[PDB]
Amino acid sequence: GAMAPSYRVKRMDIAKNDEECVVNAANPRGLPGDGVCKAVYKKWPESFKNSATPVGTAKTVMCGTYPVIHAVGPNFSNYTESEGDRELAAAYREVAKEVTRLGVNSVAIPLLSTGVYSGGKDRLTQSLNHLFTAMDSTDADVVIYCRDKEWEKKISEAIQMRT
Ligand SMILES: [Cl-]
């Protein structure tokens, strides 16, 4: 585990992360996909061998020795708010289990079920809180990756509030 387990947020490409493993915002089919998923495919294509896994689950595939945790959030275009919220909480719990199993000291993570899977809604607070509920019991340094300046400020604030 990390010496003083922390949360941080960085506004850059998660494919350039400085952590011991990465969470992919995967699709259920293990396809190259778009957004974070496409950057992950371009950086760690080997990790997409038998990566396909259902909604609300996480499946780790090693690129060399570097773990890629394919976390499948619900697409809110397809799910009801109620069922989406449940599968989004589940995907984060499976990430916590895989990060623990791997014994890594740090993990790079995007906010699941945002952008292409948000159903056109701002789910920053929803997704971030399910991230906290899962990862709070873990001892890994968590680094959250986003691309939009207003998202970084809001994520930074939510982290610092609890400190
Ligand atoms: Cl970048």
| Sequence ranges of the binding site for ADP-D-ribose | 13, 27, 35, 115-117
* Residues within 5 Å of ion ligand 1, judged at the Cβ atom: 12-13
User: Considering only CA atoms, which of 140, 151, 163 is closest in space to residue 23?
Assistant: 140
Determine how β-strand 7-11 pairs with β-strand 66-71. unpaired
Residue 16 DSSP one-character state: G
Beta bridge partners of 46: none
Question: Domain limits at 118?
Answer: 1-163
Distance 15 CA to ligand 1 centre (A): 8
The answer to whether residues 22 and 160 touch, using CB atoms and an 8 Å cutoff, is no
- Torsion of the alpha carbons at 44, 18, 134 and 5, rounded to the nearest 10: 150
**Residue in the block written with tokens 């604030």:** 157
Using the mean position of ligand 1's atoms as its centre, give its distance from the Cα of residue 38 in Å: 14
CA distance 99 to 68: 10
Encoding tokens for residue 65?
């020795």
Give the residue carrying structure tokens 């689950």.
57
Beta pairing partners, 106: 141
Number of domains comprising the chain: 1
